[PDB]
Design a protein around this ligand. Structure first.
Ligand SMILES: O=C([O-])C(=O)[O-]
Ligand SMILES: O=C([O-])C(=O)[O-]
Ligand SMILES: O=C([O-])C(=O)[O-]
Ligand SMILES: O=C([O-])C(=O)[O-]
Ligand SMILES: [Cl-]
Ligand SMILES: [Cl-]
Ligand SMILES: [K+]
Ligand SMILES: [K+]
Ligand SMILES: [Mg+2]
Ligand SMILES: [Mg+2]
Ligand SMILES: [Mg+2]
Ligand SMILES: [Mg+2]
Lengths: 510, 428, 510, 428
């Protein structure tokens, strides 16, 4: 039988796992969103067309590097590739654009162009003298945190390049003499972490302000805000986006100890969360990252807010055409944890197999979605959760289970009722029909929402509803979600475009 | 405190649910469990039957183990005179069903039980006579005595013929073979009576509660009506109050999941028929508020088969929504009753207002817990959408007049085989 | 299969009931204690021998009626009957003696000996003039509550004879003029209830003091204290029993609204609870009694303290040789609720079939014990519940399930470790071996404890333990609990007679 | 805060359990999951093997897909030299097991996978040679490559003979047929390796986690050891820290229920063998504290078959008691290991100190999660009761010296096939 349906009927979680079947094929519809960092390997229009075909739902632009002119061209190519499919509204896939801020990063300078291997036990002077900012080598290392001497002490550890090189402070005015603990090849402009230090860089720098206002002008759908430590950090990003930017979603990136400790107030202020595991796993012990990941996904699921699992998910795929077994496991387990979206960074921005990495997240996510123990998840989501709109949504999810429906079709202007359905994690895909292009793009933050953009003019109320529902039916049939004779759940508002989404039909597919 | 045992309803375990049951938490919801009253010399007058209806009678049982066709036809006539005396206000009118209880294979001198493989026929030549008479008297339902096997049911069914094809067949289980072959009997029947009088002589009396709970559970799982019957308030044949065991029996039958509870000698020949009806009404209402819906609905939901029926999925979705928003009712437009039946098997706390123009559907709906049938007599409007909303406003008026809900409260409305549309709406 | 074992394995309570099987026979051991009120129908030595044979575990003496001389003779006969079996310690069944107080009862006087039918709508004067205390009839009714006029008002209802006759106060100094609501035949010395009135009789009257001190002198095992309203009532009974009576168990009878409202403080002060449904169902609406019963049994189960379901359980059996179907249901449901004991009053004290009533409670209780959904009960008792002694007990209950043991054998001086095991409601009987005769009698308050009194002298520690365990083995084999080749759980203290009951063996039966 | 994730352990649902996981709740209990390290050029020296043991190595895997019998015998010799360098303090001595991993039916040029019904034999003539050599080298366990069917296991078993009858046979599942026939393979085997390298080439890589979780679950339910293997920390072959996916994989294998986790190239040939061992140790300890025992033990308890084995009932009773009193250890005297194995399958939080005089039992106990084997070398005392308590005091000394518990703490002691006696005692 398909869909891991045999495992779905188990009465304990242990027997659920015992019943998982590699010969039970999944449905077609892949529910977990796939966010791809764009860069030199993926930014041509022709490659972006294949990215979209392969599964990309959100294009991430990392403003830690690059110029506004460069990112504007990348965004233009994303939209050219996306709109090349706009001819057929039945098959068109909305693609969202995300701006990922630099935030309070610390980076080294450029290595002398005349790369450097740091030898364990060797000495290294860190300098703040900008005279060396492009002459870094094995003896003098410039970095850009001007206040570093005030927050580090003798004994402190300084981590460089994804925490792979470690230094220990031995002498501390405008310099630090360090000893090399774990060495390696030092490159240019590498990230620096000071775990346990009270780094006093601003949450929103002058550059961040410029990048955020640029994002408003470029009509980005969401911001991934780096190094959020507290609710007031989020409010500062909110203020910069301002009223013109009021509909841009703010995803707070949790990647240091304070952001974990203050997670609840951050989540309350944010539209969603990134588990930003790269920095997180340097700021806190690497063996604790999985606790923070499962905490955050759980609390986001409890709150009904989007959560993204990010970073090194398919890392080896930067150089290889197939992932390691731990990478296959990591993607599957993030989906089983409850992540709304999964992300690729260097695998799509700069590696040799960007399309293969997207395709692999698609395949793994689909298999893992079938393996979800919906009986326990749905029961716990219901018990831990009312107004009429919530009741209609949970009623639609139960009806979809009762008839193993091919889809839950939701007519929505802002996405809210589609979000409410997604919160209970139905097995069936949620086809969200909207006339709002921004709603269609932003919907990808939510597990299981397949947004479709209706271009037809407003009809004649009852005919206009029937138009959009029949649109969703054509979408579902064309994409292989269901066929004539299947059953679908349809959700609508009381009238017009009401937020009082209170109407459910159970409809055979003609 | 909180009314309706909602403190206990929110408990996370069944044990904590019990510990929170509160004698000072008043019931609020209307009474859901049907009350079947055997009519006899003590209750067959028109004036008494009016008070029986006012006190809570939903079904009149006529026991064809005694009496004459003419005596029972006069009783039926008086039942319908009393019932129709309220027909002038359709908002308040309560349909009342008529049940024919067969004689079946009795051994009499007077009754003799051989607890033995008795080969008397389930359906005698007399039995077919009374069954054909019930068809002529337009009864809503047959309680068939001493059913032993599915072919016994099929006989009663085929005997009732084409003209009685809509009459509900309730098999009475009251011997050991009926218990052994219960599954095939249930599949063949429209419902079951746990006929505890004979059952407790045919099998050891200490085993009756096992058979009762087994049968109620299996009927609940199948979504078919089950009646708990016999000696539930026996001491009230002579006394104006029941014993503590009798109060407990009625409450536990409701907690078990019985769709209906029944009175026999207590109403047919006893000295306090009206008090017996009123006591079953009071206990049922208290016990219904005590039901641990959090577990019951989840188990019924879990064990529901996956199907493609849109009405079935709508029903379970509607009951789910009714718990999450504490709706004042589930309003269901239904011709045959089937879609309201599908809602009732998932056991909502909220009352099910079933709007029908079919009088037999309205009477037969009393077999199902929580269904409050209302008989719409307005002509069928020309535009369907207008005829739909006429019937919905009727239900809205019924619920406000009977105190089920008030203007502004949230209710759930099910319309169209297909009953496939749910709207969660404030009461206008 | 036996023991409702098929129903035991169900994964939902609904399927558990669906699987209950009238052709699945129970084990032999009946766990629920059976308390029998002794009176003219059951007080001869020869009848008491048959009471014990039929299942009686506790003899209840109701001090609402009778003289000390009369009750002393009854207690003597109980002990003669009980000790007639002392010849064989393997088969001897300890029998407890309970004293049930009169408490703050209100009763009418004696009807004229020259019984009275009260006519609905007829007038009735209640008098306090003792001149009429033995001349009651259809016009003048004496009763013994001297302060009644101060606590009842015009409109009040007065209930007589098990609440079956009701009167309404129409005129109120030392008299009350009433109207007959529900009439009936009025007899002598009938109980009177004033629901909603603030009856101001003492919790412990001068007569109660005399009866309680008499109970100490007669070495009764427990007191059933009538009309307990609050913890301080219980303390007053405690004070009267005093230090000589300190080991007598106080069972508070809950039978009015205040006792229900103040149940937690009463339970904390008491050794156990009676659900005294006769008065309770007159003091509060009869349709609410089942709520109070299930509340109290649940909270006693949660607390691990004995709870008794009492009154009218087999009422028709006073005159008939078989019970009604509602009576069969009531006994079964009290066991399924969790009652440690069930009780008979008029059925054994004065009816025509005392032995048949005992035998029927035995048969029903055994069937209902097999029908318990142990999977849910055990899980809820564990989750809602540690020191070493508790851990060893819950460990012994789980081991008994794992091997479907024939018994849990517990060596105990005061009963405590046997009580702790009983709290988790094992299926297997608990054979409690004691050398303390009072412990052996009092153990019957606890579901599933089969007390056996060891008469052998102390041995030589390890040999003395082995002696008492082999005693329990002989008991179990002789009574049909288990056979050679079965498995039993054995519980002992660390040494000697330690309360630190911390040792468990799993033992095949030789 | 509270240590050991006890805040999350007390959650009433799995979702709330996850939401309470706390990076600031330090682990306290010793590390339960066994760590299997493939030995090769990077780790085969005596000095390196000493550090591998200190860092957490419990099992040395020798891969007979490469190398010579003489090269592997020298590695074994160095393993035993490093292990026995700690033998002077039996209180602290850690037994270290030796595993032989067969070549099996490989296609090489270098490996070739035909994802095809390949008819190469599971046990070649070479394979029987290496297996007989393992018997001569006194290995504790065999990891048999490319097991396809139960008769493959039976061959390895029968080949090992009478003299190798005590060697544990771990079937490696790494092709589609082994997954299809898993049930018969498990029944025939002493345990399972989830051999993900080949498995993820033989079946689609996106399906490996299904097979992994299926196999771990079924092994847990059977109480037989299961190993998660291959590429768990692959990037540490060249780097001193793992990737975030690698940290997650190790944690999730432990949360899944794996008895052991394993390192291959990371320790056999990589640049950071010791760091890889230390990282598996750190992650396993953190993940073990995160296990939701409230659900896991109840499900294992529920699915345990009813049997008459006194040791089985004692084991489940002991684990139950260990949760209820938060014991510092479960101390088990065992000759064969079987009674400690029976305790470990119910997954106590508390460590299992298994006291044995049998050296092979002590080494083989590392296949089972939570078993801390301690090798008693005192002579067998004359009075049994004295010899018992000698071994119990040994375990008491071990636990105090290793920081498992301290004087006054409560522990659970299991003695005697029968291990049928439980005592819940304070540590002396
Ligand atoms: O910023 C990030 O994406 C990270 O550190 O994982
Ligand atoms: O026929 C009946 O109703 C019975 O026997 O209970
Ligand atoms: O006192 C009693 O036993 C009663 O009222 O139930
Ligand atoms: O043999 C192995 O260990 C594998 O393929 O993973
Ligand atoms: Cl439709
Ligand atoms: Cl023994
Ligand atoms: K009649
Ligand atoms: K080697
Ligand atoms: Mg970062
Ligand atoms: Mg009958
Ligand atoms: Mg009383
Ligand atoms: Mg391999």
């Amino acid at each position: 039988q398909t869909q891991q349906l045999h495992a779905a009927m188990a009465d304990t979680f242990l027997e659920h796992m015992c019943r998982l079947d590699i010969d039970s094929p999944p449905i077609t519809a892949r529910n977990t969103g796939i966010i791809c960092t764009i860069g030199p390997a993926s930014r041509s229009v022709e490659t972006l067309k294949e990215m979209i075909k392969s599964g990309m739902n959100v294009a991430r632009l990392n403003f830690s590097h690059g110029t506004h002119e460069y990112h504007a061209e990348t965004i233009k190519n994303v939209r050219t590739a996306t709109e090349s499919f706009a001819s057929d509204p039945i098959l068109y896939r909305p693609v969202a654009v995300a701006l990922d801020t630099k935030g309070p990063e610390i980076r080294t300078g450029l290595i002398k162009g005349s790369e450097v291997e740091l030898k364990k036990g060797a000495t290294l002077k860190i300098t703040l003298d900008n005279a060396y900012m492009e002459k870094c080598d094995e003896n003098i290392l410039w970095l850009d945190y001007k206040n570093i001497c005030k927050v580090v002490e003798v004994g402190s550890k300084i981590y460089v390049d994804d925490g792979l090189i470690s230094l220990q402070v031995k002498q501390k005015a405008d310099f630090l003499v360090t000893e090399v603990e774990n060495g390696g090849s030092l490159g240019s402009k590498k990230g620096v972490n000071l775990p346990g230090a009270a780094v006093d860089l601003p949450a929103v720098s002058e550059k961040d302000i410029q990048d955020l206002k640029f994002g408003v002008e470029q009509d980005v759908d969401m911001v991934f805000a780096s190094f959020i430590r507290k609710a007031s950090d989020v409010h500062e990003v909110r203020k910069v986006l301002g009223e013109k930017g009021k509909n841009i979603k703010i995803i707070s990136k949790i990647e240091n100890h304070e952001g974990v400790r203050r997670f609840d107030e951050i989540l309350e202020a944010s539209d969603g969360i990134m588990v930003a595991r790269g920095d997180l796993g340097i700021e806190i012990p690497a063996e604790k990252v999985f606790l923070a990941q499962k905490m955050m996904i759980g609390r986001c699921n409890r709150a009904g807010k989007p959560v993204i699992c990010a970073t090194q998910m398919l890392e080896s795929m930067i150089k290889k055409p197939r992932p390691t077994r731990a990478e296959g496991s990591d993607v599957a387990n993030a989906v089983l944890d409850g992540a709304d979206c999964i992300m690729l960074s260097g695998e799509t921005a700069k590696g040799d197999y960007p399309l293969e990495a997207v395709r692999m997240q698609h395949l793994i996510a689909r298999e893992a979605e079938a393996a979800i123990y919906h009986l326990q998840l749905f029961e716990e989501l219901r018990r831990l959760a009312s107004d009429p709109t919530e009741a209609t949504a949970v009623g639609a999810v139960e009806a979809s289970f009762k008839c193993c429906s091919g889809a839950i079709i939701v007519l929505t202007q802002s996405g809210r009722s589609a979000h409410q359905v997604a919160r209970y994690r139905p097995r069936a895909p949620i086809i969200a029909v909207t006339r709002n292009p921004q709603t269609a793009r932003q919907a990808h933050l939510y597990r299981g929402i397949f947004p479709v953009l209706c271009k037809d003019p407003v009809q004649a109320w009852a005919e206009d509803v029937d138009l959009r529902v029949n649109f969703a039916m054509n979408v579902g049939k064309a994409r292989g979600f269901f066929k004539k004779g299947d059953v679908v759940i349809v959700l609508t508002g009381w009238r017009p475009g009401s937020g009082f989404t209170n109407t459910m039909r159970v409809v055979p597919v003609p």
